[PDB]
Amino acid sequence: DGLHSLSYHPALNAILAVTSRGTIKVIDGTSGATLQASALSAKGQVKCQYISAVDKVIFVDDYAVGCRKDLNGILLLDTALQTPVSKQDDVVQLELPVTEAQQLLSACLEKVDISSTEGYDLFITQLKDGLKNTSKVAKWATVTFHLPHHVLKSIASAIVNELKKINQNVAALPVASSVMDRLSYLLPSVDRSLMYSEANRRETFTSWPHVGYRWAQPDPMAQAGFYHQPASSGDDRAMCFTCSVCLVCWEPTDEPWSEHERHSPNCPFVKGEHTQNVPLSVTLATSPAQFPCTDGTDRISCFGSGSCPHFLAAATKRGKICIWDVSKLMKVHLKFEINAYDPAIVQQLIEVSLDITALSILQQFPCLLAGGLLTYRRTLPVLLLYSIKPGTLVQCLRLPKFAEEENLCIDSITPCADGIHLLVGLRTCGGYLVLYKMNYEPIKIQHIKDPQDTITSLILLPLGHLVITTQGGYVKILDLSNFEILAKVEPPKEQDTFVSVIYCSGTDRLCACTKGGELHFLQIDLLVDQPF
Structure with a gap:
């Protein structure tokens, strides 16, 4: 059929390929056997890139940028x-693992009696x-529930209430x-009953x-079930959502799990x-x-990431640029506006519009480096250093x-594989690769x-290394x-041109994806005799 794009999860052992149909095929990285075929309920190209x-x-x-973390060695896609x-x-x-689905079905038929709830049959039938x-x-x-928000919410709450009741x-x-x-x-529109979730x-x-403290930090205690309910100023009050235990006056050496067990083994x-x-x-x-x-309302133009492990950036066709603090709950960190009539751009030009097409954030003060094509009427690709903090x-x-007269636009921007350097690529609106040294001309x-x-891809293996896939499929x-050039591998069979490539860090074998939809793995005296 065809994949048209790829990504790989190093923490897992999964190849995440896109499909021309809008789905995602998860395949085994050791045998090439399909692991799952899931549609992301998406609405243009679909990105699946994992950011290391x-x-x-x-x-x-x-239209939208979703952010999912790995769970149980699998991805809920x-x-x-x-x-x-x-x-x-x-x-x-709402998707659930097959095993967890079995638990819910088992509870409904044997343990609890939440039957007769509005649309209970549809929930059970779907499950x-x-x-x-x-x-x-x-x-x-x-398994994916497809139910009105109130139906599923009421059914789940009844199960929780009944499972808590029994x-x-x-x-x-x-x-x-x-x-x-x-x-x-899903409906954004201290209470102890709301502490059932770590977040x-x-x-x-x-x-x-x-x-x-080292181990008494906010997040570690939430892991152990504790939540902060201060009673006074500077009150270090940590209570368990279910145990009812109460702990105060913590110390630097205290550890969530240790205190909870000793203070309440039950x-x-x-x-x-x-x-x-x-x-x-x-x-x-x-x-x-x-x-x-x-x-x-708009369309998504940029989805670039950065070497910083706390930030992801995206841009819109209307000029609105979003920056998520992907750390933890993907909270939107900064949304700003891009105006072509900017003091820097209006002078660098020596009607006007500005369009961002690439994004990236640099880390060893943090800065947002976007790639854009300006169209005045001539066009000019430039770099834009915006503020993040x-x-x-x-x-x-x-x-x-x-570039002013050759009609080129930036297509990718990536920090160097080794560091303290940046590699940018320019294609026509047959290309340019320009390497900048990060500014703590090229x-x-x-x-x-x-x-x-x-070029049709870029991995920037650890000036480090580079791996691309050309128009010719090489x-x-x-x-x-x-x-x-280290290795110009050739397309298999007419030729099926290579369109992208990825590296499996769990198998040490390079992985290539063709336009047609094929996967290829590329590789990248005796003491006994002496005296005692």
Whole structure:
């Protein structure tokens, strides 16, 4: 069929390929066997790129940017790009693992009596068929509820209430708790009952006074089930969401788990039982998508990331640029406006419009480096140094003079593989590769003339290394020190041109993807005899 793009998860052992159909195929990296075929409920090209520095899987469709973390060695991809609903009557989509689905079904038929709930049959009917159809593919199999927000939320809450009522700890309670939290997140429109999720507990520690401790930090305590409910100024009050234990006057050497067990061994959570806890792993692995614009009306043009492990950036066709603090809950960190009539740009030009087309953030003061094509009527690709820590153009760097008349636009911007350097590529609106030294004119230049050698990918292996895929279908594994081609592998069978490539850090074998849809793996005296 064809893939048209690829990405790989190093923490996992999964190849995440895009499809021309809009789906994602997860394949085994050791045998080439399909692991799952899931649609992200997306709305143009679809991005699936995993970002190593941030250590999360970033999906992007034309409109929204979703951010999903790994869970149980698998990715919940059925609603990666699904965005929050606006009415409780809206039909929400919620994916669950096959095993967790079995727990929910088992609870409904044996343990609890939440039957007769509005649309209970549809929930049960949908759940049952998912398990039967899904009955390594099994490990990645998932079941997707398609129900009105109120129906699923009411059903999940009843299960939680009933599972809490019966008090017999079963695996459905944490799953139902996760469902309730995920539904709450999908409708954005201290209470102890709201501490069943680690994130809510984590948020409670916003006024934690012992931030200087090593293990008594806000997030570690939330992991152990504790939330901050201060009673006075500087009160280090940590209470468990379920145990009811109360702990005060913490010390630098205290550790969440140690205190909870010693102070209350009877807690179901300390013992690892099936409490109402919703860990951060499911929360990060099931967070809803987020539109970059405040309204989401536009199309997405940029999805670049940066070497900083706390930030991701995106740009819109209307000029609105969003920056997420992908750290933890992907909170939007800074949204600013791009005006072509800027003091730096209007002078560097010696009618006017500005369009951003590439994004990147530099880390060893943090700066947002976007790539754009300006169209006045002539056009000029330039660099734009904006502020992150806001909305101020520190420096606009005009690219060489020849770009003014050659009608070129930046297509990719990546920090050097070794560091303290930046490699940018320029293609026609047959290309240019320009290397900048990060500015704590370029230091190197390269021009690509052959129309069949235009770059179509970039991995920037550890000037480190480079791996590209040309228009002719030849990947040109190469070293950036002096632009030395290391290996020009050729397309298989007419020729099926290589279109992109990725490196499997879990197998040490390079992985290439063709336009046609094929996968190829590329590789990159005796003491006994002496006296005692």
